[PDB]
């Protein structure tokens, strides 16, 4: 719904798992890449740096369908095919203790709204 802007106090979950008031420090776009691995499983939220067959931070995404190699969550490298680049607007928030998270719009609540 309603837009959240930088400098707004909002309520979001801290890394400890509870909601606290925090402040939006900045709005950022995070670019996620989506790939089909060679076993046919699909990932929708690789980061550009996880493509280890090409330097996508420098040269941008692979071509759609291009064969790539990916460094995965288990630290190993696997073969894949590039599907798409998916930029998402996100919100960098900071809590009173100084910790920060980058979170999605649905994870941020305004002061007036009920929390689950």
Swiss-Prot record:
Transmembrane segments: none annotated. Ubiquitinated by RNF8 and RNF168 following DNA damage, leading to its degradation. Degradation promotes accessibility of H4K20me2 mark for DNA repair protein TP53BP1, which is then recruited. Also ubiquitinated by the SCF(FBXO22) complex; leading to proteasomal degradation. Coiled coil: none annotated. Signal peptide: none annotated. Ubiquitous. Residues 2-59, 60-116 form the Tudor domain. It is found in: Nucleus. The record marks 50, 72, 78 as: Histone H3K4me3 binding. Belongs to the JHDM3 histone demethylase family. The 2 Tudor domains recognize and bind methylated histone H3 'Lys-4' residue (H3K4me). Double Tudor domain has an interdigitated structure and the unusual fold is required for its ability to bind methylated histone tails. Trimethylated H3 'Lys-4' (H3K4me3) is bound in a cage of 3 aromatic residues, 2 of which are from the Tudor domain 2, while the binding specificity is determined by side-chain interactions involving residues from the Tudor domain 1. The Tudor domains are also able to bind trimethylated histone H3 'Lys-9' (H3K9me3), di- and trimethylated H4 'Lys-20' (H4K20me2 and H4K20me3). Interacts with histone deacetylase proteins HDAC1, HDAC2 and HDAC3. Interacts with RB and NCOR1. Interacts with VRK1. Interacts with FBXO22; this interaction promotes KDM4A ubiquitination. Histone demethylase that specifically demethylates 'Lys-9' and 'Lys-36' residues of histone H3, thereby playing a central role in histone code. Does not demethylate histone H3 'Lys-4', H3 'Lys-27' nor H4 'Lys-20'. Demethylates trimethylated H3 'Lys-9' and H3 'Lys-36' residue, while it has no activity on mono- and dimethylated residues. Demethylation of Lys residue generates formaldehyde and succinate. Participates in transcriptional repression of ASCL2 and E2F-responsive promoters via the recruitment of histone deacetylases and NCOR1, respectively. This is Lysine-specific demethylase 4A. The lineage of its organism: Eukaryota, Metazoa, Chordata, Craniata, Vertebrata. The chain holds residues 897 to 1011 of 1064 of the full protein.
């Amino acid at each position: 719904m309603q837009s959240i802007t930088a400098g707004q106090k909002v309520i979001s979950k801290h890394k400890n798992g509870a909601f606290y008031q925090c402040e939006v420090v900045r709005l950022t776009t995070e670019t996620f890449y989506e790939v089909n691995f060679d076993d046919g499983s699909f990932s929708d939220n690789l980061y550009p740096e996880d493509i280890v067959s090409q330097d996508c931070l420098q040269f941008g995404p692979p071509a759609e369908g291009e064969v790539v190699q990916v460094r995965w969550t288990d630290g190993q490298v696997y073969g894949a095919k590039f599907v798409a680049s998916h930029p998402i607007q996100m919100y960098q928030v900071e809590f009173e203790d100084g910790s920060q998270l980058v979170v999605k719009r649905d994870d941020v609540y305004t002061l007036d709204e009920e929390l689950p």
